[PDB]
Amino acid sequence: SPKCTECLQYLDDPELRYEQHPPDAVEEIQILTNERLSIFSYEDLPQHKLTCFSVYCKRGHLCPIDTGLIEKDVELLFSGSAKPIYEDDPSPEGGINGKNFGPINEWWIAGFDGGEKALLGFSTSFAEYILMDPSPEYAPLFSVMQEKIYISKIVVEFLQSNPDSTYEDLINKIETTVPPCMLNLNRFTEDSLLRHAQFVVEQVESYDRAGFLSPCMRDLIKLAGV
Amino acid sequence: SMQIFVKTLTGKTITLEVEPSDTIENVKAKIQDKEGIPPDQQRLIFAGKQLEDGRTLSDYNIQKESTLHLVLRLRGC
Amino acid sequence: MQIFVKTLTGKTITLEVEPSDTIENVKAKIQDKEGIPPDQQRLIFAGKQLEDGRTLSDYNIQKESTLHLVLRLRGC
C-alpha cells in the first residue's frame, strides 16, 4: 500500500484517475503567444478561459484542490483547452489544448455580480485562468468543489444585498435559489451550507478584506461549529 | 441615443443608453454610475479586441444592440 | 538589423541586434529598454521557446522577425 510522494494518494487504490490529454497539447508558455488568445501595463496579467480542464500532481494523478494540497505547498499542475476571456461556449472546440499549466500559486472565487455563473480562477506565475467546464474524466472530483463555489456566491451576494438579514432568511434564500444544471442537484438544503460552514465563512472574510459583524454571519458561525 | 448591452463573465447584463459618438471612457463612467464599479478596474472588449479609452463607438463599429464584454481587474489578497 | 518583440500586453519593442548575439544577450538587450530582468523573460518564436545558449542565427531568425515575449511574474 504505497502513497504518492506528491499527493499522498494510494497507487493500488482504484478510482485513481491518471490525467489524459491530446497529443496536440503544448506547454503553458507556447499557448500564451497563440494569436487566437490575443485581444490586442506589465502589472496587468493575461486572463483567459480554460474549459474541459483537469488538475493533477507532478506524477499525473488527478487531484482535488479542496484537500489542501496547495496549502501544503504541493505543486499542482492543470491542463485543458484555453479560450479567449470573452467566450461563453464551454465546448473544447474553438479552444487551444494545453498541458502542464502552473503550478497553481492560488485559486480564487470571482463574480459576485448577481449573475448566473460563479467564477473559479487559477493564478499561475505566467497568467490567470478563469475555469469553465471540467473534463469528462475530472467531473467526479470537481463535483463536491462546485457546491462550495456557488454556495459561497449565494452567501456573499445575499449579505451584500441584505446586510441585516437573519440566519433563517439565509437558509431560505439558499433553499429558494435554484441550483444550476452544472451542479446536477435538484435543490439546496441547510445541509448544503452546514457541510461547508468553515469554508463559507473563510470566503466571506476574504471578500471583506479585499476592499463580518452581521447577525446572520454570527449566528451562522456559532451554530457553524467554526 | 442608442441602446447597448454590457455582459460580464458571470452572465449579468447591463443596459446602457449611449450615443455612437460617445467614447469608451464614457461607457466605463456609465458602468460606474449603474453598477458602482470603478472605471480603473474595467476593461471593455468588442469583436475580440480590448477597446482603448481614447476611441469612440463609431470607430469600432459598435452598432445598436451590440454586446460589450466587461472583464474586471479584480482586487484580491 | 532591426527585430521586434511583441508583448502579451500588445506592446511592440524595436531592437537592433546582430545574428551573432545570443538569446541570453537578446534578453540582455530587452532589459535596458524596458527594465525587466532576463530571468523573468520567456522568448517564443514560431511556437518554439528560445533557449539561452543559442543565437538568432541558430533559429534561422532572419531580419525583421517578431519575437513574442512572455514574462514570469516577480514572485512564487
Binding site: 505547498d73 | 458602482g36 464599479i37 474586471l72 | -
Partner: peptide
C-alpha cells in the same frame, strides 16, 4: 452615490507566495 469595487475571495494560496 456609493461605489462598490470588484473583488475575489482567496480559496487557496501556496506558502511560497508572500
Amino acid at each position: 452615490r456609493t461605489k462598490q469595487t470588484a473583488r475575489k475571495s482567496t480559496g487557496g494560496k501556496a506558502p511560497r507566495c508572500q
